[PDB]
Amino acid sequence: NKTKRAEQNLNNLPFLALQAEQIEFLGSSAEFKTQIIELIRNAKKRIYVTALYWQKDEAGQEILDEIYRVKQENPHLDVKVLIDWHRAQRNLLSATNADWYCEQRQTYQLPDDPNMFFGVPINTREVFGVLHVKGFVFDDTVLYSGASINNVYLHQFEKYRYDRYQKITHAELADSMVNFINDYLLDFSAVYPLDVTNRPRTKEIRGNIRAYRKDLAQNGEYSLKSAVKLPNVLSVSPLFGLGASGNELNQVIEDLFLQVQKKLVICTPYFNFPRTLQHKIATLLENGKRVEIIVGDKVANDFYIPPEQPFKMAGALPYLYESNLRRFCEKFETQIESGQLVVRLWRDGDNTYHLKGVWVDDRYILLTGNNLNPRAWRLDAENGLLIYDPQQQLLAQVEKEQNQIRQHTKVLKHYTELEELNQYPEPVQKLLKKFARIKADKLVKMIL
Amino acid sequence: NKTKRAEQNLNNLPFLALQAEQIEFLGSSAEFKTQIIELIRNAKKRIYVTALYWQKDEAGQEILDEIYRVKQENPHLDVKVLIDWHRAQRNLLATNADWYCEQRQTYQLPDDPNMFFGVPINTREVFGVLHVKGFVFDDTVLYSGASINNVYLHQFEKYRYDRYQKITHAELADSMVNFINDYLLDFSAVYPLDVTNRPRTKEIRGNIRAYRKDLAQNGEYSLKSAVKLPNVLSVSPLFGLGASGNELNQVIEDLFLQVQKKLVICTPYFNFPRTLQHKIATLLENGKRVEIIVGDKVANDFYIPPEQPFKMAGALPYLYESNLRRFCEKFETQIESGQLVVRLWRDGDNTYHLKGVWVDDRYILLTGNNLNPRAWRLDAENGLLIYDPQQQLLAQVEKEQNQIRQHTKVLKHYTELEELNQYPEPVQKLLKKFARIKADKLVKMIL
């Protein structure tokens, strides 16, 4: 029984005890920016950051300035920033992020002058996998979020890109995350500093990348010192996954979906679930459980191009996702109608939506950078903090964050409330038709 | 050092002695069809087939009819046809699996055997397919890159050009059947295609992953009477699946590195993995001769004449041409001196599907390996490496190569291939967009 196998797997997870006071769910990207800054200024021992990227724009610069300032005050501060290797060395769609890290290092010229920026390659080509592991550790504090460092994620000006942010003050969790980074992520046969002029070329290190991915996929795991099974207290379990086989994070998500007793809530940026998760939703709906899915409106996707502007191919992506959502809402029309399935669309002017999350009944809360898409199931390196809350110690804080999240949403009442293809811009129509005919749209879903 | 290790590695391969009279190079696709029929009709013990696919069409039906006849007449005949699991269950561009099931019911054999089995090399076809080749009829191996459909078998006017070698040697035959039994046919992951009630791949996902990992890591051919460094015409069966520890791909890499005088390559699409690009660059920079033989755009089956309505898949042949164009401009001086020879194959609307590596007059690799990024990381491939240290097969090799060269022209200069702005407008638009967002790079890696 897959369902009974799932209960067993969840019960077997190790968990570290967490006081409710040790966790805060931040409200907004502006708060997130403020917390980053406050945490950097107060750091005395270490600062570890794993993010998809850290951009050379004004927010990137303000944050990096804070780092150099504390580092110049504290020469023994252990600072390590891991970002995706490929993403750091290209432009979007003149200077790359890597060029900028070097520029900054040369320009500040700290007396110490250590390497601080490291590029992690999760595969030999960006398309076949990137670093999606999340977490910032400042001394004994974890700041966990799907957000990277650029203007929109930190609300530098008027626009923002919405994510979730959790601050956990817990020495043993912090030590576990830094240990993973040092022990598993930072393998110097494949990982190179990006803040030096002499960086190897990819072609130059293909074999090393391969061996590194294979090793990390099979062995990377977090370790806990004082973990128990089935604690009777609010608790946290750190999870890692890379690749399709023996992926603990994905096994946990699949099992979370199978073990819903009453209600499942899901946040995802794009409506693009792996088939395995789509099937598990269908079972839940067939068996009377409630399901709430929160995604961005078309216009809250960052590939969206206002139809007055000149159209580019990538601008069809939000429409591809919407029409897949429309098909889903049609399939589950009875459930939409009875309120068994709640589909919410987020929209706030031109701001974009990048929230990920899974909530199971009142019992589990998964904080993850996982986009819940086929890329995440096969290609990318992911992590998660699984919070177990058996006595509902966190229920009030979870609901407060969820109500903030729902503020800029509307409940879709009928699949016909979503635009049909004929209402789409003419070049999008052409494109979607072209792709659908030769099932290239299936390829897009699996790899983007 | 890589060159050094390459020689060592090749010398370490186990070889089985062959006699020159035990190998036939077939001259054409009609002849392949004729030989398939004859070999089926004469089989008394076993018929084993591994192929990408076996199409429901006149040619597919005719070969299938032959199988059913010999089986009806010889009830103990061991018959196993293994094709790709995903490919059998979709259409070009209801399915082949439904037609195998229908044929089984219709022919109504008394012991009602399963004959057609589906091999899942990955949970999604995009991520790995069965490119393992070889037909075994009793003690005769028929090795070709061809699948079973109308064009591969020249059923009507159109053909799809491949290579075909017939080897009669019971030990080779045994080695290949044993591999099929021992590694390919794991019934935890492999399912008969010709039943009414096939599992959805959703239900067997975990099995496929375990099967893929096991095969990648353990699959290999065994021989009984093999020696290293024989003084006779001999053969070595090779398998590979995956990026790491791939023996077939290591042998291909090593062959390139160990060229002394000349290298000849056939590939059905000009799309080398980076490792082979670098090695070809190295041979050229070191005075070795290289001859590469590819299809014209027109000999690509996604080609749509500029007169007919364009469909986006029609841009693929142009992507392969510009790839070749860029290569011929890079090695412009080598083309000029004659050290690099690029041939383009074209025969009306017949299509081109040749694969091959020939090193000097010493090594002849027979393989369904397309020599692309897919074959380097995704697909399950095999090959037969012939070693001919005394040039016992050279006459037959040269005859086959002469035939292969018949519908080719030698490229005089890279500008002989159209530039982007001379492509048809719809083609141009597409390629321009794809290049901007690097979609062309993606296509090279997965197609």
Instruction: Give me the residue from A203, A245, A446 closest to B124, CB to CB.
Output: A446
Q: Which residues of B touch A208 (CB under 8 A)?
A: none
Give the integer Cα–Cα distance in Å for A316 and A420: 14
Give the integer Cα–Cα distance in Å for B1 and B53: 41
Give the integer Cα–Cα distance in Å for B124 and A378: 11
The answer to whether A396 contacts chain B (CB < 8 Å) is no
Which of B1, B121, B123 to mutate to test binding with chain A, by most A CBs within 10 Å of its CB? Answer: B123
Give the integer Cα–Cα distance in Å for B236 and B386: 7
Which residues make Cβ contacts (< 8 Å) with residue B182, sequence separation at least 6? Answer: none
Structural contact between residues A76 and A168, judged by C-beta atoms closer than 8 angstroms: no
The two three-digit tokens of residue B403, written as one number: 């035939």
Distance of CA B302 to the CA centre of its chain: 18
Domain ranges of chain B: 1-19+227-447, 20-226
Q: Helices B29-41 and B58-73: crossing angle, nearest 10°?
A: 20
Give the integer Cα–Cα distance in Å for B30 and A146: 60
The two three-digit tokens of residue A32, written as one number: 């997130």
Query: Sign of the C-alpha dihedral, residues A362, A368, A373, A374?
Result: negative
Structural contact between residues A268 and A372, judged by C-beta atoms closer than 8 angstroms: yes
Q: State the DSSP code for A310.
A: P
Structural contact between residues A266 and A344, judged by C-beta atoms closer than 8 angstroms: no
Give the integer Cα–Cα distance in Å for B143 and B49: 10
Q: Do A279 and B202 touch (CB under 8 A)?
A: yes
Give the A:B interface size as CB pairs under 8 Å: 47
Cα dist from B271 to A268, B77, B161, B323, B442, whole Å: 37, 41, 18, 7, 12
Give the integer Cα–Cα distance in Å for A26 and A36: 11
A78 in helix, strand or coil? strand
Cα dist from B433 to A218, A285, B136, whole Å: 38, 41, 47
Breaks in chain A (C–N > 2.5 Å) following residue: 93
The answer to whether A110 contacts chain B (CB < 8 Å) is no
The two three-digit tokens of residue A340, written as one number: 């068994």
The alpha-carbon radius of gyration of chain A (Å, integer) is: 22
Q: Which residue has the tokens 């994070």?
A: A249
Instruction: Give me the residue from B123, B437, B446 closest to A93, CB to CB.
Output: B437
Cα dist from B329 to B338, B410, B412, whole Å: 14, 15, 11
Structural contact between residues B365 and B252, judged by C-beta atoms closer than 8 angstroms: yes
Give the integer Cα–Cα distance in Å for B434 and B441: 9
Q: Do A245 and B124 touch (CB under 8 A)?
A: no
Neighbours of A441 (CB within 10 A): 19
B413 carries an active-site annotation: no
B381 carries an active-site annotation: yes
Helix H, strand E, coil C: the string for A348-361 is CCCCEECCCEEEEC
Structural contact between residues A72 and A110, judged by C-beta atoms closer than 8 angstroms: yes
- Main-chain dihedrals φ then ψ at residue A119, nearest 5 degrees: -100, 125
Q: Which residue has the tokens 């491949």?
A: B162
How close B219 gets to chain A, by Cα (Å)?
Answer: 19
- Main-chain dihedrals φ then ψ at residue B17, nearest 5 degrees: -60, 135
Give the technique used to solve this structure: X-ray
The answer to whether B244 contacts chain A (CB < 8 Å) is yes
CA angle (A60 as vertex; A59, A66 as ends), nearest 5: 90
What resolution in angstroms, rounded to 1 decimal?
A: 2.2
Q: State the DSSP code for A54.
A: B
Structural contact between residues A335 and A284, judged by C-beta atoms closer than 8 angstroms: no
The answer to whether B243 contacts chain A (CB < 8 Å) is yes
Q: Which residues of B touch A128 (CB under 8 A)?
A: 445
Burial annotation B370-400 (CB, 10 A radius, 16+ → b, else e): bbbbbbbbbbbbbbbbbbbeeebbeebbeeb
Instruction: Give me the residue from A279, A438, A447 closest to B93, CB to CB.
Output: A438
A163 carries an active-site annotation: yes
Read out DSSP for A391-410?
A: T-TTHHHHHHHHHHHHTTEE
Element (H, E) at B283: helix B274-284
Give the integer Cα–Cα distance in Å for A52 and A88: 9
The answer to whether B199 contacts chain A (CB < 8 Å) is no
The two three-digit tokens of residue B104, written as one number: 């089984």
Instruction: Strands of A306-363 (E only): list them.
Output: 341-346, 352-353, 357-360
Question: For chain A, how far is it from start to end, CA to CA, in angstroms?
Answer: 33
Q: Which residues of A touch B436 (CB under 8 A)?
A: 93, 312-313
The two three-digit tokens of residue A161, written as one number: 């890109």
Q: Helices A426-437 and A317-331: crossing angle, nearest 10°?
A: 70
B277 in helix, strand or coil? helix
Instruction: Give me the residue from A210, A275, A276 closest to B244, CB to CB.
Output: A210
Question: For chain B, how far is it from start to end, CA to CA, in angstroms?
Answer: 33
Of A229, A404, A436, A406, the closest CA to residue A316 belongs to A436
Point out the catalytic residue in the list B86, B154, B169, B353.
Answer: B353
Residue type, A36: I
Which of A2, A201, A206 to mutate to test binding with chain B, by most B CBs within 10 Å of its CB? Answer: A206
Structural contact between residues A252 and A13, judged by C-beta atoms closer than 8 angstroms: yes
Give the integer Cα–Cα distance in Å for A43 and A67: 10
The two three-digit tokens of residue A387, written as one number: 């919070």
- Main-chain dihedrals φ then ψ at residue B318, nearest 5 degrees: -70, -40
CA angle (A32 as vertex; A26, A36 as ends), nearest 5: 125
Q: Left if phi > 0, otherwise alpha if psi is -120 to 50, otherwise beta: which for B287?
A: left
Give the integer Cα–Cα distance in Å for B39 and B157: 24
As a whole number of angstroms, the longest Cα–Cα distance in chain B is 67
User: Nearest 10 degrees: CA dihedral of A200, A201, A202, A204?
Assistant: -80
Q: State the DSSP code for B162.
A: -
The two three-digit tokens of residue B314, written as one number: 């029609």
Residue B273: half-sphere exposure toward Cβ, Cα within 13 Å: 21
Of B53, B93, B41, B62, the closest CA to residue B156 belongs to B62
Element (H, E) at B409: strand B408-410
Instruction: Give me the residue from A245, A314, A446 closest to B209, CB to CB.
Output: A245
Neighbours of A398 (CB within 10 A): 18
Q: A119 forms bridges with which residues in the sheet? A: A83, A192
The answer to whether B205 contacts chain A (CB < 8 Å) is yes
Bridge-based pairing of strands B351-352 and B340-345 is unpaired
Which of A5, A86, A202, A203 to mutate to test binding with chain B, by most B CBs within 10 Å of its CB? Answer: A203
Give the integer Cα–Cα distance in Å for A337 and A415: 10
The two three-digit tokens of residue A75, written as one number: 């020469």
Which residues make Cβ contacts (< 8 Å) with residue A269, sequence separation at least 6? Answer: A295, A296, A301, A353, A354, A355, A356, A371
Of A18, A92, A115, A318, the closest CA to residue B438 belongs to A92
Instruction: Give me the residue from A127, A214, A279 closest to B442, CB to CB.
Output: A127
Give the integer Cα–Cα distance in Å for B270 and B62: 33
Point out the catalytic residue in the list B86, B131, B154, B169.
Answer: B131
The two three-digit tokens of residue B59, written as one number: 């040619």
Point out the catalytic residue in the list A322, A382, A389, A401.
Answer: A382
The answer to whether the B1-19+227-447 and B20-226 domains have the same CATH topology is: yes
- Main-chain dihedrals φ then ψ at residue B120, nearest 5 degrees: -95, 110
Continuous H helices in B143-262: 170-179, 205-218, 247-257
Neighbours of A401 (CB within 10 A): 20
A61, with CB counted inside 10 A (0-12, 13-18, 19+), is: middle
Which of B1, B90, B92, B127 to mutate to test binding with chain A, by most A CBs within 10 Å of its CB? Answer: B127
Could you give the strand order of the β-sheet that contains A141-145, starting from the edge strand earlier in sequence?
Answer: A23-25, A165-169, A141-145, A136-138, A46-50, A78-84, A117-120, A192-193
The two three-digit tokens of residue B36, written as one number: 């398939």
Q: Which residues of A touch B446 (CB under 8 A)?
A: 443, 447
The two three-digit tokens of residue A82, written as one number: 């891991």
The answer to whether A92 contacts chain B (CB < 8 Å) is no
Point out the catalytic residue in the list B66, B162, B247, B379.
Answer: B162
How close A255 gets to chain B, by Cα (Å)?
Answer: 14
Long-range contact pairs involving B56-61 (C-beta distance under 8 Å, separation at least 24): B56/B96, B56/B99, B57/B149, B57/B150, B57/B155, B58/B150, B58/B155, B58/B156, B59/B33, B59/B148, B59/B149, B59/B150, B59/B152, B59/B153, B59/B155, B60/B148, B60/B149, B60/B150
Structural contact between residues A408 and A347, judged by C-beta atoms closer than 8 angstroms: yes
Give the integer Cα–Cα distance in Å for B443 and B189: 29
Read out DSSP for A177-241?
A: HHHHIIIII--TTT-EESSSS----GGGGHHHHHHHHHHHHHH-----SS-BSS-SS-EEEEEEE
Of A74, A101, A75, the closest CA to residue A87 belongs to A101
CA angle (B128 as vertex; B127, B130 as ends), nearest 5: 165
Q: State the DSSP code for A28.
A: S
**CATH class as words, domain B20-226:** alpha beta
Q: Do A206 and B274 touch (CB under 8 A)?
A: yes
- Main-chain dihedrals φ then ψ at residue B155, nearest 5 degrees: -65, -40
User: Nearest 10 degrees: CA dihedral of A84, A87, A89, A93?
Assistant: 180
The answer to whether B217 contacts chain A (CB < 8 Å) is no
Q: Which residue has the tokens 């897009």?
A: A444
Long-range contact pairs involving B134-137 (C-beta distance under 8 Å, separation at least 24): B134/B48, B134/B50, B134/B176, B134/B382, B135/B36, B135/B39, B135/B47, B135/B48, B135/B49, B135/B50, B136/B46, B136/B47, B136/B48, B136/B49, B136/B173, B136/B176, B136/B177, B136/B180, B137/B39, B137/B40, B137/B42, B137/B43, B137/B46, B137/B47
Structural contact between residues A3 and A258, judged by C-beta atoms closer than 8 angstroms: yes
Give the integer Cα–Cα distance in Å for A86 and B408: 41
Q: State the fold for domain A1-19+228-448.
A: Endonuclease; Chain A (3.30.870)
Give the integer Cα–Cα distance in Å for B403 and B293: 13
Bridge-based pairing of strands A341-346 and A290-296 is parallel
Neighbours of A399 (CB within 10 A): 11
Point out the catalytic residue in the list A66, A86, A155, A163.
Answer: A163
Give the integer Cα–Cα distance in Å for A194 and A237: 31
The alpha-carbon radius of gyration of chain B (Å, integer) is: 22
The answer to whether B445 contacts chain A (CB < 8 Å) is yes
Burial annotation B187-224 (CB, 10 A radius, 16+ → b, else e): eebbbbbbeeebeebeebeebbbebbeebbeebebebe
User: Nearest 10 degrees: CA dihedral of B321, B324, B326, B329?
Assistant: -120
Residue type, A169: T
B425 carries an active-site annotation: no
Residue type, B190: V
Read out DSSP for B58-117?
A: HHHHHHHHHHHHHHHH-TT-EEEEEEETTGGGS-----HHHHHHHHHHHHT-TT----EE
Element (H, E) at B330: helix B316-330
Burial annotation B90-102 (CB, 10 A radius, 16+ → b, else e): eeeeeebbbbbbe
The percent helix, strand, coil of chain A (3-state, each to 5) is: 40, 20, 35
Q: State the DSSP code for B299.
A: G
Could you give the strand order of the β-sheet that contains B78-84, starting from the edge strand earlier in sequence?
Answer: B23-25, B164-168, B140-144, B134-137, B46-51, B78-84, B116-119, B191-192
Cα dist from A28 to A52, A147, A297, B203, whole Å: 20, 11, 19, 41
Neighbours of A136 (CB within 10 A): 23
Domain covering B1-19+227-447 in this structure, CATH number? 3.30.870.10
Give the integer Cα–Cα distance in Å for B117 and B87: 12
Superfamily name and number for A20-227: Endonuclease Chain A (3.30.870.10)
The two three-digit tokens of residue B61, written as one number: 């039906």
Instruction: Give me the residue from B126, B202, B313 closest to A275, CB to CB.
Output: B202
The answer to whether A2 contacts chain B (CB < 8 Å) is no
